[PDB]
Amino acid sequence: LDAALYEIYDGLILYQQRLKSLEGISPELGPALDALRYDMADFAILMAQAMEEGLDSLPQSFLRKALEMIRKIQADAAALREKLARAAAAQSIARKLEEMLEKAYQILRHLAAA
């Protein structure tokens, strides 16, 4: 589970940076991309805190904060996907992003039900 979170953390950073290449496709998508990148950056910081402290030692309040954050990001990622539907490449990144965010959710879902 811990090793799985390290790999998902790597995904968060990768796809957050990959979203920066979608800039310039449309002015309507700009603010959606930026907000998503900044929220993902905050979530990565939170997952960094979780790993360094220890997943077995995480309090319920922390897990609730993390679950709240990832679900909001997942909703916003879905909205980005819907708006996108260069364009094809953006959809591929958005698709892989969604999958990675779901993996992050499943880690936290498992920790919360432990």
Author numbering: 4 to 88, 96 to 124
Excerpt from the publication:
We use this approach with the aim of blocking the granulocyte-colony stimulating factor receptor (G-CSFR) signaling, a crucial driver of granulopoiesis, that when dysregulated can promote tumor progression and inflammatory diseases. G-CSFR is activated through ligand-induced dimerization of the ectodomains of 2 receptor subunits, which leads to the cross-phosphorylation and activation of the intracellular receptor-associated kinases. The native ligand (G-CSF) engages and dimerizes G-CSFR through 2 binding sites in a 2:2 receptor:ligand complex that juxtaposes the receptor subunits into a signaling-competent configuration. Here, we describe an approach for antagonizing cytokine receptor signaling based on designed cytokine mimics with idealized structural and biophysical properties.
Through this study, we aimed to design a series of bifaceted, designed ligands which could engage G-CSFR either in a non-signaling ternary complex, or in a 1:1 stoichiometry, outcompeting native G-CSF. By modifying designed G-CSFR binders, we engineered hyper-stable proteins that function as nanomolar signaling antagonists. X-ray crystallography showed atomic-level agreement with the experimental structure of an exemplary design. Furthermore, the most potent design blocks G-CSFR in acute myeloid leukemia cells and primary human hematopoietic stem cells. Thus, the resulting designs can be used for inhibiting or homing to G-CSFR-expressing cells.
